[PDB]
Structures are given as C-alpha cells and as structure tokens.
C-alpha cells in the first residue's frame, strides 16, 4: 500500500534534510560514489561560509584581530576558485584555518544572527582538518551538513515497514511557495517543519520580516486549510540542537514579547508549541501530531520517524 508525504515550511527549515535521513535509515545510506558528489558541496559552502563571514566584518565595522590576515583575506579570492570545482589545496585550507580561528572573524561569527550564515558553517570549518585531506570523502554526516536551496519539486522512495513511501520536498522561500499547490492532490500526511531556532533571525527574502513569524503564518494557513482535513498534519519543531544553545544566550522576546519563561530548553520550547498549536482553529476535530527534532541526527529522526509511521498506518490504514 502507498502513503503520501508532503514536506513543508518556511526557508531553510530542514525539509531536505529530513528526506536525506529517509535514504540514511531505510536504504543503505548514501555510497561512496555518492557521498563523492556531496564533496563539491562541501567545500563550496566552506567557503561561502569563512567568506560570508568576512563580508559581515566589513559592513558591521570589525577590524581582523591581528592584520596578518589582511594577506589570508586576499589570497582567499586569489585560491578561491578550485574550492568550487571540488578541489581543496593545502594551502587553502591554512588560509581557511587562520581566518577562522582569529578573534575578529570570530566576533563576527557570534553576531550571525544580523546577517545570513550557513547553520553548518561552524561544522566545517572546524573540520577543516578532516575535509581537506587529499582524497576527502564525505561522511554520512557531512552530507547531511550540506545546504543546497531547493527550487521545485523533488521526489524521493523508500520502503519501510511494508509500506510504500513516495516523499515530496519543496522549496520554502516566499519565491517559491506559488508551486506548494502542485503536491496537494491525495496527501497521506503532511509534514511541517520549522526552525525553532530561527526566532531571533530574519526572512533572507525581507529583512523586516521576522523568520519564526512567518513560519507560523504558514503554519495557521496549511493547518486550517479545509482541503487537508483528512490529512495528518505532523508539525516538527526542527533545529532543536540550536535551539538548545540559542536559547541560552539569545532573549526569546524578540519574537515573543510577552514570553515570561527562562532562557532555558524546557520552557522556551514548550511555549513555541504552544503558540504553533494555538494557531489550530478547530481544536476539536482536528489534532497536530507534534515532535522536536533535530534533522542532522539520523538517531533522533529515525526513532521520530518510527512513531510517526505508526500513527500514519494506525489511521490511513
Ligand atoms: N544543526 C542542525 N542543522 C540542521 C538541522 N536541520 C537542518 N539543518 C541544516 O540547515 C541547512 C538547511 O536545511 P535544509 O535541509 O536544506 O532545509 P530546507 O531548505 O528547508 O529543505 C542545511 O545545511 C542542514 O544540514 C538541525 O536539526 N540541526
Ligand atoms: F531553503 Al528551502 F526548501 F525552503 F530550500
Ligand atoms: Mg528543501
């Protein structure tokens, strides 16, 4: 028997991820061969990410900590280029490990938040060592790390517990969400997912608009839209992991004013699924299967996936 699903949300949410994660658990993973063509995609957001950074420090004013890196900043562009064609010299990767580890690009790094960073730019960059090495392939993991913005419709089979999965992933960006209405015939279940720690962060697509607000825009018109009635809709509070250091020093005011709790995981997070949940207009006859998740992990999304089938097979079924 088939089952439908439909992943969806705001940009950057983790969608594709969790449908990396579908061919982790269920089909032998990602090769060698494949985990290769993943290689490019990791040095070229290493570098975006180092040279993003270093854009930042410019227009927020910080100087390098020792001007040395001045010459690391220029041959940066200067060796650039191979980075992008999948190849990583060695003396890229010293310029790539300096920059990262003087104190400016790194004050730089904490404020993030006021520009637009790559989630695994940390990741990598502190791998350098590892991705750089001649012959690198990347792990399970990097490949999971990788950000590619997802434009259109993707479709992805699986098999698991005898049924036939067909999984849908679409794009997020407010360009984008005009094709949502090509995946809406016969859903099984929906799955929606959103950047818990995207609440301090703003839309890429207009600075104005706060990220966690236009998720839950989204989230009240999927939700209580009558065309999905009888579609499981399985929202899943993504990013926990960041969340759960966000949190700490981040004040979750700057999206929820009136949030009265404590700068901790518990708290924070059971009061963004509330609001999420809030949003449900017919509390009654319609239910939000709902899970914290953390994309990345294949252990966290593997057990969150099993719960998840039972519920779909208990009911379409
Ligand atoms: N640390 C961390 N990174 C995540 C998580 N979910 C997604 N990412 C990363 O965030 C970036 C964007 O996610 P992606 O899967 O492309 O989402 P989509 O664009 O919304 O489908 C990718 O580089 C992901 O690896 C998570 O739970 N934790
Ligand atoms: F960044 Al997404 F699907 F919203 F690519
Ligand atoms: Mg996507």
């Known amino acids: 028997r088939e ?32 985990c290769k063509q993943y290689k490019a995609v990791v040095y070229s957001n290493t570098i975006q990410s180092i040279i993003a950074i270093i854009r930042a420090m410019g227009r927020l004013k910080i100087d390098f900590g020792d001007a040395a890196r001045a010459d690391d900043a220029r041959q940066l562009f200067v060796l650039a280029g191979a980075a992008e064609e ?5 003396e890229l990767a010293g310029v790539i490990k300096r920059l990262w580890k003087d104190s400016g690009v790194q004050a730089c790094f904490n404020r993030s938040r006021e520009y637009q960073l790559n989630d695994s730019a940390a990741y990598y960059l502190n791998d350098l060592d590892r991705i750089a090495q001649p012959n690198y392939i990347p792990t399970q993991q990097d490949v999971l790390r990788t950000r590619v913005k997802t434009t259109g419709i993707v479709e992805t089979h699986f098999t698991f517990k005898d049924l036939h999965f067909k999984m849908f992933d679409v794009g997020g960006q407010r360009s984008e969400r005009k094709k949502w209405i090509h995946c809406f015939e016969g859903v099984t279940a929906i799955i929606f997912c959103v950047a818990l720690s995207d ?12 990220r966690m607000h236009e998720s839950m825009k989204l989230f009240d018109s999927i939700c209580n839209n009558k065309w999905f009635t009888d579609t499981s809709i399985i929202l899943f509070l993504n ?19 009136e949030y009265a709790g404590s700068n901790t995981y518990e708290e924070a997070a059971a009061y963004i699924q509330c609001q999420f949940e809030d949003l449900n207009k017919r509390k009654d006859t319609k239910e939000i299967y709902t899970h914290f998740t953390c994309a990345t ?16 097979i208990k009911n379409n079924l």
């Open 3 to 34: 089952v439908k699903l439909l992943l969806l949300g705001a940009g950057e949410s983790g969608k594709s991820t969790i449908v990396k994660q579908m061919k982790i658990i269920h089909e032998a993973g990602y090769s060698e061969e494949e």
């Open 86 to 90: 999948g190849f990583m010299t060695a």
């Open 199 to 210: 609440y301090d962060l703003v839309l890429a697509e207009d600075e104005e608009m706060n």
């Open 239 to 257: 990013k926990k992991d960041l969340f759960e250091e966000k949190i700490k020093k981040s004040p979750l005011t700057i999206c929820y004013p």
């Open 297 to 312: 992990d294949t252990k966290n999304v593997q057990f969150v996936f099993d719960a998840v089938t039972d519920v779909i």
